[PDB]
Amino acid sequence: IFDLVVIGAGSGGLEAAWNAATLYKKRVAVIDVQMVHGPPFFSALGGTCVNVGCVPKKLMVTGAQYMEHLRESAGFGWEFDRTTLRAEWKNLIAVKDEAVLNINKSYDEMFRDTEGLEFFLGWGSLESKNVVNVRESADPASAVKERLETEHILLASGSWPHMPNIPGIEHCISSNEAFYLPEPPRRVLTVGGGFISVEFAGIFNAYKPKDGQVTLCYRGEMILRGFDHTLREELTKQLTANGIQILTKENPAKVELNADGSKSVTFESGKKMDFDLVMMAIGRSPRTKDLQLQNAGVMIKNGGVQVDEYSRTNVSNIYAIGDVTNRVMLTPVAINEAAALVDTVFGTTPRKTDHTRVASAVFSIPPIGTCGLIEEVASKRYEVVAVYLSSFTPLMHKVSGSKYKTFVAKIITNHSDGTVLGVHLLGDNAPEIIQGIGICLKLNAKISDFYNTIGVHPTSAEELCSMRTPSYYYVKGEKMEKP
Amino acid sequence: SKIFDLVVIGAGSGGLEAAWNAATLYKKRVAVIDVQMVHGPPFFSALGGTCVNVGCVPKKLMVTGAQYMEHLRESAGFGWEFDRTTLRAEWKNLIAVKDEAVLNINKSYDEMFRDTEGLEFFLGWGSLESKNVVNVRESADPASAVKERLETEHILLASGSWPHMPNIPGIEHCISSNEAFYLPEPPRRVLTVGGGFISVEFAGIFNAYKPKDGQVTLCYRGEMILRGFDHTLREELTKQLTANGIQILTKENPAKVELNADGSKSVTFESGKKMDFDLVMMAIGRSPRTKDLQLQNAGVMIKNGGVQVDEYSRTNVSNIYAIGDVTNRVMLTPVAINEAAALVDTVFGTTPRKTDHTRVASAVFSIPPIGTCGLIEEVASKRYEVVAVYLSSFTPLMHKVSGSKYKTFVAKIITNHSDGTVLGVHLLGDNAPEIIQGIGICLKLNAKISDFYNTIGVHPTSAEELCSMRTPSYYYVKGEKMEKP
Ligand SMILES: Cc1cc2nc3c(=O)[nH]c(=O)nc-3n(C[C@H](O)[C@H](O)[C@H](O)COP(=O)(O)OP(=O)(O)OC[C@H]3O[C@@H](n4cnc5c(N)ncnc54)[C@H](O)[C@@H]3O)c2cc1C
Ligand SMILES: Cc1cc2nc3c(=O)[nH]c(=O)nc-3n(C[C@H](O)[C@H](O)[C@H](O)COP(=O)(O)OP(=O)(O)OC[C@H]3O[C@@H](n4cnc5c(N)ncnc54)[C@H](O)[C@@H]3O)c2cc1C
């Protein structure tokens, strides 16, 4: 009765569903737990990105950057009674809510108007290789609302926050509830060193009350493992310069709520500190459990569904894309894989996603843009590696007062032939600058291609066309320098 | 034998690049001449050139300042509140911090001269006595006192350009962009004459710093502002500038300017229309500065205003070269720098080098800005038999909530449809100058439209839209616009 059933109406799910029903005119059903965003299940039609991810995150980080603009405007002659300045968290949450709601509604119309595309509200799970059930709860004993027999199944359930099993974890929230907070915490602890932790630390820092403090803690020695160490070091200094406390090598042991409703957090070290809110942004896990993957023999490996490079699992009827495969957890990668799967299945030529050289950003204040390898893995994979590093205070920040805002640009090459293996940026607009650079690496550009291009002046991005001489090299993993 | 290896007239973007490279890479003794040590009246430009003193660097600081009017207004849609009745822009503070920023670069070029052996700076007006002697005199007047007589084996002409004032009655009541950088306080009614980037950028600056019942008017004698840019970006930018309070008078042409008794200027246009302003700024074009050089003493040819050069920047006279704005090729600082470095390699180095002037990316810092690289469709469709135009315009979600819902982002890619090669990319919207730099490297790489849409986007940005354009909106076959049925 159906050709494709997609469990999950998110970035990858909705893309594959549309791409199939429209381009190959095959009939598909998609399942999701909610129509509109918000509690109880948070994610809804549209997926994590639309509901509790990229889109609301970006509105909130933009709102948080206005603390920067409003302070820095003074260096250019804008005066106002700065004592009347107030950040109003619920005006931001209200506009965010409306913006997300309109995208949920939009997706509903898309089903109501595209023939051959049917949405089913509920929880999908595998009854067998060819039958998917839409039950009414995550529990596999709830009333089967619909039973769908299909010629193909795509799993696109995404991921979900991972909460540690520590005493008092019920007094903690994840990023999901952080999108619905009624008012901004006075003392908030954000646990984790990845992009979600770093981004929410910037958001809370801007909308915090008069005597507020944001603390970020990470169990390792520097935030953002997996990123370039110069960028990690420099972003730490700029985040602490903007009033965020960063506690590294610290990890919560227990959380117990005090009389006030505040939380006392005891760290593994014995340190004890009180906060009004504790957000765990420790990690995200593929959500496989409710799919009942054992009922069709779909194999999972490290928490996520095992798929081959064409997103097929081990049961030929079923495929999986997006976060549930645990490859690169980014919306554009899920959308890319979804189009590549519908082409390999219902099209003529098999397409597979290239997962290397994907550009991405961290929307911290200041932001990061990055594409390619970091020198630590580059020197492991190549015999001689050149590192070109440039760091400068942009002139607007000499004038704005924010003299600590160093822009960092770093290019890494295979020095034997000049191929750019990675470009890493910290500074304003770095997410916008890295997109063109992602196209360059996909075209296998060499460093001579960068410095033979004429620069757009005055911009930060022209620095990338002005890096001609390496700062140091890695020869067989050893750092070396020209004398 | 005789003394300098190179004398450079003009210590600006190209002159200082050429001078530096020859003295350090090639160990040549180089003399560089310019008329002032630090920016400002009377000669405006000085050590560093036009970009540093009265060009790129001061105007980007003033446009960043103007942009805060946007930020301060738009902050309210995200919940920021303050007593908006206390808000004022203090022009004098903006000029004071711009002056310090430019002064500090003037001071470091000076230090650079003190620190480099074989690089000498001479303060004065340079001109040719013959093809191997350069005079440094006290003023532009060819008969003023010779302050230095410099014998040389090679001469580089890097004198830049200057505002072109039209000969209309009353022009002496108008200023150019040079004086606009030193105005004591902001004009209440200002007219900027011209439809090019300098007129449009300053319109945005004046609009943000105008007083209480201030009005900025831009007039252009042709049909639409920014002739030479992409037509959608021209239409759209006119819409967005108008939406922010700038009045644009297209197809209006000034006949005369006269000074009213109170000090205001009265402008009568050729259509009989007449208006009063407190300041009238001419920004109708810039011309090569060749007059004072006394080029006829060496026999250097001039063609359509500028010094005639070949692709390697050699004039018709051996051992005399010219780069930058005086050659009237592409009047942009990075182009002048590139030419300078190619020229010193050709002359003192072993391998001849020339600048590629095609596919140069550039920006207009209007509010909102423009980023552009390559061909606009009207010239591409005349050079190529089939051209595909991909067009995408959308309101960034940020502006759907900030209140400025008129701030449409426009991304346009035009290709040679026979092989998919991207011929031009044109962008209007926030951060478009920063986005276009990476695209400039792609055009130099001869990227195809498939290489753009096969790149995974960075989400959420405006730039990822350039990776989402798979289908042409329309086409140009032998110059006529056609569409798929
Ligand atoms: C706070 C945060 C910030 C992020 N920011 C960015 C960013 O800036 N840029 C970026 O590119 N990525 C970002 N991401 C990651 C991005 O959101 C994901 O990579 C992307 O959503 C993955 O798409 P997907 O198709 O894999 O799943 P999703 O969008 O996660 O879709 C999953 C769908 O499955 C549904 N579901 C689950 N199980 C079932 C079931 N059994 N039955 C029915 N429905 C079910 C869910 O309800 C869901 O809506 C962010 C994520 C988070 C949490
Ligand atoms: C308002 C404005 C905005 C601009 N904005 C941008 C921008 O954002 N980006 C961009 O890339 N370009 C911009 N430009 C253009 C850029 O400034 C020029 O293209 C660049 O300066 C040209 O370099 P040059 O070496 O040709 O000459 P210049 O930098 O113009 O140097 C010429 C020097 O010669 C001197 N001189 C002249 N005649 C004599 C003589 N006879 N003797 C001695 N010295 C002499 C001067 O005093 C001067 O300082 C802008 C220009 C203006 C005016």
UniProtKB/Swiss-Prot annotation, chain A:
Cystines in this chain: 49-54
What terms describe the molecular function in GO for this protein?
flavin adenine dinucleotide binding; glutathione-disulfide reductase (NADPH) activity; trypanothione-disulfide reductase (NADPH) activity
Q: Where does FAD bind?
A: 32-48
Give an example GO biological process.
cell redox homeostasis
Q: Give the cofactor note text.
A: Binds 1 FAD per subunit.
* UniProt EC number: 1.8.1.12
Keyword entries, A-Z:
Cytoplasm, Disulfide bond, FAD, Flavoprotein, NADP, Oxidoreductase, Redox-active center
Q: Looking at its record, which EC class is this enzyme?
A: oxidoreductase
Q: Name one GO cellular component term.
A: cytosol
What cofactor requirement does the entry state? FAD
Catalytic residue list: 457
Transmembrane region(s): none
Q: Per UniProt, what does mutating residue 136 to A do?
A: In strain: Silvio
* Family according to the record: Belongs to the class-I pyridine nucleotide-disulfide oxidoreductase family.
The miscellaneous remark of the record is: The active site is a redox-active disulfide bond.
Which NCBIfam families does UniProt cross-reference here? trypano_reduc
Q: What does this protein's UniProt record list under function?
A: Trypanothione is the parasite analog of glutathione; this enzyme is the equivalent of glutathione reductase.
Subunit and partners:
Homodimer.
**What is this protein identified as?**
Trypanothione reductase
From Swiss-Prot, chain B:
Q: What is the effect of changing residue 138 to A?
A: In strain: Silvio
Q: Tell me the keywords, alphabetical order.
A: Cytoplasm, Disulfide bond, FAD, Flavoprotein, NADP, Oxidoreductase, Redox-active center
Q: Which GO terms describe its cellular component?
A: cytosol; mitochondrion
Catalytic reaction(s) noted: trypanothione + NADP(+) = trypanothione disulfide + NADPH + H(+)
The set of disulfide-linked cysteines is: 51-56
| Cofactor, free-text remark | Binds 1 FAD per subunit.
Asked if Disulfide bond is a keyword of the record, the answer is: yes
Per its UniProt record, the required cofactor names are: FAD
Q: Which residues form the active site?
A: 459
Amino acids binding FAD: 34-50
Q: Record's PROSITE patterns?
A: PYRIDINE_REDOX_1 (PS00076)
Q: Where in the cell is it found?
A: Cytoplasm
User: What EC numbers are recorded for this enzyme?
Assistant: 1.8.1.12
Instruction: Give the UniProt family note.
Output: Belongs to the class-I pyridine nucleotide-disulfide oxidoreductase family.
| Assembly information from the UniProt record | Homodimer.
Protein name according to UniProt = Trypanothione reductase
Q: What is the organism of origin for this protein?
A: Trypanosoma cruzi
Q: What is the lineage of its organism?
A: Eukaryota, Discoba, Euglenozoa, Kinetoplastea, Metakinetoplastina
